[PDB]
Design a protein around this ligand. Structure first.
Ligand SMILES: CCCCCCCCCCCCCCCCCC(=O)OC[C@H](COP(=O)(O)OC[C@H](N)C(=O)O)OC(=O)CCCCCCCCCCCCCCCCC
Ligand SMILES: CCCCCCCCCCCCCCCCCC(=O)OC[C@H](COP(=O)(O)OC[C@H](N)C(=O)O)OC(=O)CCCCCCCCCCCCCCCCC
Ligand SMILES: CCCCCCCCCCCCCCCCCC(=O)OC[C@H](COP(=O)(O)OC[C@H](N)C(=O)O)OC(=O)CCCCCCCCCCCCCCCCC
Ligand SMILES: CCCCCCCCCCCCCCCCCC(=O)OC[C@H](COP(=O)([O-])OCC[N+](C)(C)C)OC(=O)CCCCCCCCCCCCCCCCC
Ligand SMILES: CCCCCCCCCCCCCCCCCC(=O)OC[C@H](COP(=O)([O-])OCC[N+](C)(C)C)OC(=O)CCCCCCCCCCCCCCCCC
Ligand SMILES: CCCCCCCCCCCCCCCCCC(=O)OC[C@H](COP(=O)(O)OCCN)OC(=O)CCCCCCCCCCCCCCCCC
Ligand SMILES: CCCCCCCCCCCCCCCCCC(=O)OC[C@H](COP(=O)(O)OCCN)OC(=O)CCCCCCCCCCCCCCCCC
Ligand SMILES: CCCCCCCCCCCCCCCCCC(=O)OC[C@H](COP(=O)(O)OCCN)OC(=O)CCCCCCCCCCCCCCCCC
Ligand SMILES: CCCCCCCCCCCCCCCCCC(=O)OC[C@H](COP(=O)(O)OCCN)OC(=O)CCCCCCCCCCCCCCCCC
Ligand SMILES: CC(C)CCC[C@@H](C)[C@H]1CC[C@H]2[C@@H]3CC=C4C[C@@H](OC(=O)CCC(=O)O)CC[C@]4(C)[C@H]3CC[C@]12C
Ligand SMILES: CC(C)CCC[C@@H](C)[C@H]1CC[C@H]2[C@@H]3CC=C4C[C@@H](OC(=O)CCC(=O)O)CC[C@]4(C)[C@H]3CC[C@]12C
Ligand SMILES: CC(C)CCC[C@@H](C)[C@H]1CC[C@H]2[C@@H]3CC=C4C[C@@H](OC(=O)CCC(=O)O)CC[C@]4(C)[C@H]3CC[C@]12C
Ligand SMILES: CC(C)CCC[C@@H](C)[C@H]1CC[C@H]2[C@@H]3CC=C4C[C@@H](OC(=O)CCC(=O)O)CC[C@]4(C)[C@H]3CC[C@]12C
Lengths: 691, 691
């Protein structure tokens, strides 16, 4: 049997990043705001997590633990900590160097294994190597006890430099460091659990066993939901220096650390069984690809140093953990099967990725069609590329259900699948061209019909001339070799030209109430400004670049197969990655465009408060409209302006509270659009104030 | 084997009301306010509970269900609904008769089965009758869809009465009621679950299985915590008419409904097996002793009708529901064992209620001792009573570990146990006497000395005269008949006298920084205010009556044994109840006194908000200090006044965030005590405002 239950990995990830996704769409849709997520955070970080730790360490048997694994992971984490710390000490701004050295190693060493790592390890190693579930509750607290103190010492040194007074105490900063380390629920709950394990004999009392199980089982889902709740509105556009340091930190989290852990395990472990040693090394690798634990974000926000870099890094690393961990575990278990089960495995992962991406794509197309935003040219081409992605994702499903079974319709399904995939590649090219045209000249008369017929016909011509030449080889399971070298040649030439088209573009990249059209010209100006938006050129650029990433990966795959024509144990990674991306592009498209915020007594009391102690305040200054030609309401305020004023005054805690309060004010007959065209939102629109 | 695993009942309750307790002490200690509890409530009521329903019905097999059980429970609920509704229709205020008829029946028919009933049924009927776990998810949504429509129709009728118009049509009212019930997640989620059960073949897809398990396992742990969070402050002192209607409603929830369900089940069940029918009737009884689901509270707060009666009724019903479930499940299976295993069972439940009470009682005693409040007179007397209550629990614990084992020390352990128990009875008597004396002029100091010597020596004299007369019958397991009939008489005489004493008592019911030493009087008055209270004679009275309830129960038990001397299958209920109360009084004392509220950039930003837009509004309004003899600070405001002003203005939504804002603003060096003796709390203390 395989060292791990690989077939159970994808649902578990689908659970984890499923629950997180729920939380995100709960936070963005104002179902659970930022203030209201504090209660969930306190519950999961004060009651659920300490009960899980206590229950899972009291029963733990300290006499049957492979300490070599813990030593190896601790050595690897310490090495990454030291390397990052010394590198920051050498090259960084001298003003905040200590800060950049007191948080960056913590970002690159800790892991989100309690909430986002434990479900995956449980799914992988529960019916094969259950003892692997103990190390999650040992490595994380120990590494939190032997690395966090050094980082916090550095942060307290930076705070000392913030004051730079006559205080020269060297023990005070260290004491505060270990005090802030010891004031963490994880550390002292670990200590209490160990003490009670020593007191008892690994027999949790029956009186408290049910309480502990009930309060600990409700951690994983709740913790993931809270993580999703805090993971909305954090990531922001960064300076190029911030971009490159984020790249380096994320790479040091999911590239340096896993390799270091696997090397140390294959260096220290003395296990007689080769299979056990290989599985242990695989576990060491898969333990380091875990995302950055959100504890680094709260540490940064407590010290108030690099809050944006640390929070955005944790947010991005949470995304990047999923595909990396999936491909890592699959590639790690790949050299354990014959090439024929290898082909079945790659087909099955393609089918799973295809079903889930198809659901996401159908959803995103639902937003596109019911939002009527596809009329604009960029969104028209995005919808066209998205329906092409839906066609390829469904064609893969039908192909796996018809591979080598019905040769009669195999020609038809192959034609549909690869015509749609070539359409996706060429449509990435056409998207690049469309943003090129938008940047070059505005208000052009070029039809979209020519672009559409090209993007759906050149793939059709390619597949037709591919079918005409050669013969059908209805024996290979994979679709890429249904025809042979000819098919790979066509798939390489169209893929090549697609990336040249993409790269060429990329490189160069009075009144009181409602007023009449003359007296409400500012509303028309705001409507024109809004029409100037709703394009999201940066969003399209991001989609195109992330698509070009997989386009280049598949180009490298086809060139390697054509020229070398030798597997060499490296080509398996290439085929797996190309099969992953070809039908996982739906996830990317859903992530960028499939999700967006665009698409009585209590309210009376709130309106009374606002009109009692806040109507006549400095908001009167912030509410004003300039003369719209000859006449104006002179009582119109921007939604963002009122939100900012409410935040600064203190009636709201974040933007969500401000927008909900404004929604209540609107429902209370006080706030309304100057022309009633729209409804309260945190965007630049003038709103009249009535009375 | 027994029809239910009764030995696992106590831990499960201890889990459930344990988790709730955590939530309460989380809410009371301001760890999670109500606004922050809104997020947890939304999570549990929108993502966890719907996932649990969907997962538990997609796999549900409608082909094999005992429909007679559901028919019986629905008939019983409908009968209770009809009886209560017609009763409040006949006798109630005509102005709000419809309100009292549309909320009371849904208060006395629904149950907290999803969160507070499922764990108990799982603990009782998982390894014996697992099919009993389906009916929790079947009866509750059905009763929601067949009873709450009528209730909501009545509430909409009351709303029509509130705003009378010439629209006799009932179509709008019934439509609004059906829309209100249909907007509940518990309704359309079970509809979708049934639809997907029909679509599939009770095989939830592996892609969503892990997601559903992860998002549904975090409901039982989290719903109880949210219930505890929302249980803080919802109980309010009620008028005597409200008291009697609450008595009637709680009785109709845990006396009428379970009896009706059991009768209807033993009316419609055609089960051939007598054991299965008896177990089903026991399940029907144990399903109606469940507490009122908090959905009735949110319905009442949505309609804004009897919010105080419904909320307080749910709060009280949940607490009453625990001992009633314990005694009901024990008594129901009580005649399933021989009298000697009967004695072992009552001893074991005594040992369980003994250990838990000792843990909470040591906690309460520690609170009293480190509070230094035992120097007070009522508090000294109740501290002595509490020490006796701890000694009796410890003696019972030792007795169970020494019963019929070491006859040498059995005399000593028995003497300790029953001397402590007689001390508790006589100390309830002396507490009644002390509160009667406190109700008087109280110019005479209470004789602490002779009262304590009496309360701790008269039990010693009683146990000595009991030991002197008679012989040692060291064969009976129960401690009430270790000696014989003489012990019964000795217990009955002191118990009688204690209630006579208690019944008699019951029926007897300038400057800016610092004020000058010679120019400061009102600060001395507000200091006197504190020790004018801090006696909580109402709390002591409530504890006294709660104790006399069990004293009367035990008196009835001993009188029945003395006079009738016949078991009759009813005296077993008496011995179980007396053994439950003898060592359960620690729970009452802990609930009464063991828990109470008595025992930098963000703060700068809040202080900036205050020093930008809030002092001009409040200083001119909320601060006013009379001349302290000759001079005063003229800037002292009561904490309650400031909290009320903050609530009304809108800086806080309730008292919790109001006092949190006050604590922050104190830490900002603006608000402080007039003489700096005390911190910021929501009481009647004067606070200066500095600059
Ligand atoms: C049979 C069971 C009956 C249950 C009945 C109720 C029992 C409740 C026990 C716990 C209640 C605790 C409520 C305290 C309210 C405040 C919570 C609290 O202190 O914060 C949560 C803390 C950690 O916080 P932090 O992040 O370090 O905060 C800084 C802090 N302010 C400071 O001091 O800077 O962390 C904690 O306080 C964690 C508390 C949660 C406890 C969960 C795990 C332990 C369960 C209890 C163990 C029983 C098993 C014992 C075995 C046998 C023993 C005889
Ligand atoms: C060595 C441990 C072995 C035992 C095993 C269990 C392990 C427990 C986990 C370890 C933590 C122990 C918790 C004890 C309390 C420590 C207090 C603490 O850590 O401070 C944190 C808390 C609250 O946070 P805050 O922001 O400081 O709040 C203060 C104030 N309220 C404010 O507004 O800023 O500060 C407070 O203010 C807290 C006061 C609340 C106290 C209420 C406790 C009730 C316990 C009742 C349980 C008794 C047993 C019950 C039996 C069964 C009953 C159903
Ligand atoms: C492996 C799967 C990966 C999945 C990835 C993520 C997918 C997420 C799907 C669900 C998340 C939806 C987020 C919605 C955000 C808004 C919340 C929302 O609508 O309010 C909560 C609602 C119901 O509340 P209400 O009391 O009626 O509120 C009144 C409401 N405003 C109204 O319309 O008046 O209640 C809800 O919104 C309930 C939604 C929670 C869903 C949990 C149970 C269903 C899980 C999904 C089922 C899939 C199984 C299908 C099997 C295979 C089928 C092909
Ligand atoms: C928010 C509003 C949602 C409205 C949605 C529209 C109505 C509901 C959908 C239409 C009715 C149901 C159609 C499918 C039922 C029949 C097909 C079926 O189940 O076959 C089983 C088959 C079983 O597959 P199989 O039989 O091929 O299994 C073999 C698998 N291998 C090969 C790997 C061994 O497929 C499924 O399991 C169905 C797809 C499940 C996808 C689960 C993950 C997707 C993530 C999103 C889930 C839903 C989120 C909710 C919001 C999104 C909108 C949906
Ligand atoms: C919040 C701060 C709390 C600090 C507490 C003070 C420090 C911790 C306690 C002192 C050290 C440990 C002493 C006990 C260890 C040895 C005895 C032992 O447990 O033996 C097992 C024995 C086992 O009993 P047994 O072996 O007789 O079991 C047989 C049972 N029958 C007969 C029914 C079959 O006793 C216990 O289980 C002890 C009670 C455990 C808890 C039970 C529920 C109590 C409710 C509260 C739980 C705790 C909440 C946390 C806060 C409250 C304060 C505690
Ligand atoms: C990724 C794929 C492959 C790419 C290959 C090519 C990329 C380069 C590879 C080597 C990089 C080593 C580090 C070199 C850093 C170069 C400087 C830099 O990126 O910017 C430093 C940044 C400048 O900021 P500045 O614009 O001055 O800001 C002013 C306003 N505050 O100032 C800072 O913010 C300073 C903080 C920098 C912290 C760097 C930590 C790096 C840790 C991981 C590196 C690898 C470690 C392991 C190596 C292998 C094992 C031995
Ligand atoms: C060379 C060795 C390869 C080893 C492979 C495995 C290890 C890879 C290690 C991770 C590499 C670092 C990735 C970190 C990307 C950081 C990007 C970033 O900071 O950009 C933020 C951006 C969001 O931008 P924002 O402005 O918020 O969006 C506005 C919306 N219109 O958001 C983004 O731009 C998100 C970018 C991340 C998207 C996923 C990238 C995954 C990378 C690995 C995939 C698998 C391996 C690919 C190998 C290709 C081979 C040809
Ligand atoms: C087996 C037969 C019984 C079956 C189930 C019960 C049905 C019949 C009894 C129904 C009614 C029981 C509860 C009555 C609650 C009435 C409300 C009440 O007492 O609340 C007021 C009290 C104090 O409120 P507070 O605001 O603090 O007042 C300040 C004083 N100035 O607030 C409180 O302290 C809350 C109320 C405490 C309730 C104590 C326990 C219940 C009363 C005993 C009778 C029912 C249980 C019998 C068996 C117990 C053991 C199994
Ligand atoms: C419990 C232990 C034993 C107790 C023995 C003594 C009582 C025996 C039972 C008596 C029942 C009488 C029911 C009618 C209520 C009597 C009057 C009352 O308590 O107050 C009704 C209250 C009026 O309040 P008022 O003082 O006027 O308020 C002033 C400000 N508006 O107005 C209201 O708020 C009306 C609310 C009526 C709700 C009645 C619910 C009854 C449900 C259970 C009854 C039995 C049902 C099952 C019986 C067996 C099956 C048929
Ligand atoms: C193996 C790989 C190819 C797929 C398996 C993991 C998926 C289930 C993951 C990968 C990418 C994830 C998505 C990446 C990006 C986001 C945006 C994220 O929200 C934000 O970061 C934006 C919040 C805001 O609007 O401020 C919410 C989750 C979501 C949809 C993720 C949902 C889960 C996804 C699809
Ligand atoms: C193997 C393939 C399938 C890659 C798997 C990962 C992607 C599906 C993820 C990883 C990074 C994600 C992106 C990271 C950042 C953002 C920005 C985010 O928008 C913001 O600027 C956040 C704030 C806001 O939306 O208000 C929207 C999601 C998006 C495009 C994410 C879309 C989904 C991405 C590409
Ligand atoms: C069957 C018997 C032996 C035990 C039944 C279960 C116990 C574990 C229950 C019985 C009474 C319960 C207590 C009754 C009263 C309260 C007060 C309650 O808080 C409030 O209602 C007031 C909150 C506020 O001050 O605002 C918090 C739970 C608690 C301690 C309860 C915790 C759980 C207890 C001890
Ligand atoms: C089988 C034996 C152990 C009896 C089990 C029942 C008692 C232990 C429970 C049942 C109801 C409980 C009461 C329910 C509600 C309250 C009000 C609660 O708070 C108040 O006094 C109201 C104001 C507030 O604190 O919010 C204090 C605990 C108390 C008296 C509880 C004390 C413990 C009681 C009596």
């Amino acid at each position: 049997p395989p060292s791990m239950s690989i077939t159970r990995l994808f649902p578990a990830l689908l659970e984890c990043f499923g629950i997180v996704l729920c939380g995100a769409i709960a936070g963005r849709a104002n179902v659970i705001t930022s203030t209201q997520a504090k209660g969930l955070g306190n519950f999961v970080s004060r009651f659920a997590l300490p009960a899980l730790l206590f229950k899972n360490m009291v029963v733990l048997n300290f006499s049957n633990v492979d300490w070599s694994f813990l030593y190896s992971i601790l050595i690897a984490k310490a090495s990454v900590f030291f390397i990052v710390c010394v590198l920051t000490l050498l090259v960084a701004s001298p003003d905040s160097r200590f800060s950049k050295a007191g948080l960056f190693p913590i970002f690159a060493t800790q892991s989100n294994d309690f909430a986002l790592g434990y479900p995956i390890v449980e799914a992988l190693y529960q019916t094969t190597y259950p003892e692997y579930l103990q190390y999650i509750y040992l490595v994380a607290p120990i590494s939190l006890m032997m690395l966090n103190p050094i980082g916090f010492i550095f942060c307290e040194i930076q705070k000392w430099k913030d004051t730079q007074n006559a205080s020269q105490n060297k023990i005070k900063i260290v004491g505060l460091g270990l005090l802030r380390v010891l004031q963490n629920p994880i550390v002292f709950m670990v200590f209490i659990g160990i003490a009670f394990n020593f007191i008892l004999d690994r027999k949790v009392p029956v009186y408290v066993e049910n309480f502990l199980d009930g309060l600990g089982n409700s951690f994983s889902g709740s913790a993931l939901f809270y993580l999703g709740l805090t993971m909305v509105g954090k990531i922001k556009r960064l300076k190029k220096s911030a971009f490159v340091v984020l790249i380096l930190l994320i790479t040091a989290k999911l590239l340096v650390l896993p390799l270091l852990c696997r090397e140390m395990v294959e260096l220290l472990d003395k296990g007689d069984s080769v299979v056990n040693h290989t599985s242990l090394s695989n576990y060491a690798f898969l333990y380091g690809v875990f995302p950055v634990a959100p504890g680094v974000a709260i540490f940064a926000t407590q010290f108030n140093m690099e809050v944006e870099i640390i929070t955005s890094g944790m947010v991005i690393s949470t995304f990047v953990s999923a595909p990396i961990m999936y491909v890592s575990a699959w590639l790690l278990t790949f050299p354990t099967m014959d090439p024929k089960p290898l082909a079945y495995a790659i087909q099955n992962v393609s089918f799973d990725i295809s079903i889930v991406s198809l659901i996401s794509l159908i959803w995103s197309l639902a937003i596109l069609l019911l939002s009527k935003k596809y009329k604009q040219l960029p969104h028209m081409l995005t919808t066209n590329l998205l329906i092409a992605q839906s066609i390829v994702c469904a064609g893969m499903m039908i192909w796996n259900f018809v591979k080598e079974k019905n040769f009669v319709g195999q020609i038809l399904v192959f034609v549909l699948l690869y015509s749609s995939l070539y359409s996706t590649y060429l449509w990435t090219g056409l998207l690049a061209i469309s943003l090129f045209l938008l940047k070059k000249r505005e208000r052009v008369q070029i039809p979209v019909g020519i672009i559409i017929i090209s993007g759906w016909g050149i793939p059709a011509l390619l597949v037709g001339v591919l079918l005409i030449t050669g013969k059908h080889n209805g024996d290979s399971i994979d679709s890429a070799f249904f025809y042979g070298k000819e098919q790979m040649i066509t798939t390489a030439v169209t893929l090549f030209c697609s990336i040249l088209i993409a790269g060429i573009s990329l490189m160069c990249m009075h009144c009181v109430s409602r007023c009449n059209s003359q007296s409400c010209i500012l509303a028309q100006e705001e409507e024109q400004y809004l029409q100037s938006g709703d394009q999201q050129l940066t969003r399209h650029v991001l989609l195109c670049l992330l698509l070009i990433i997989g386009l280049f990966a598949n180009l490298s795959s086809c060139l390697w197969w054509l020229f070398n024509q030798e597997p060499g144990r490296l080509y398996v990674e290439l085929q797996f990655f190309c099969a992953v991306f070809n039908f996982g592009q739906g996830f990317i498209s859903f992530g960028i465009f499939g999700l967006d915020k665009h698409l009585s007594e209590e309210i009376k009391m709130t309106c009374q408060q606002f009109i009692h102690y806040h109507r006549d305040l400095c908001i009167r200054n912030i509410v004003k409209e300039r003369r719209c030609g000859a006449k104006t309401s002179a009582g119109t305020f921007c939604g963002c302006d009122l939100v900012s004023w409410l935040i600064e005054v203190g009636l709201a805690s974040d933007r969500g509270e401000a927008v909900i309060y404004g929604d209540r004010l609107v429902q209370g007959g006080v706030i309304q659009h100057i022309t009633n065209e729209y409804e309260f939102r945190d965007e630049y629109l003038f709103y009249r104030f009535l009375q």
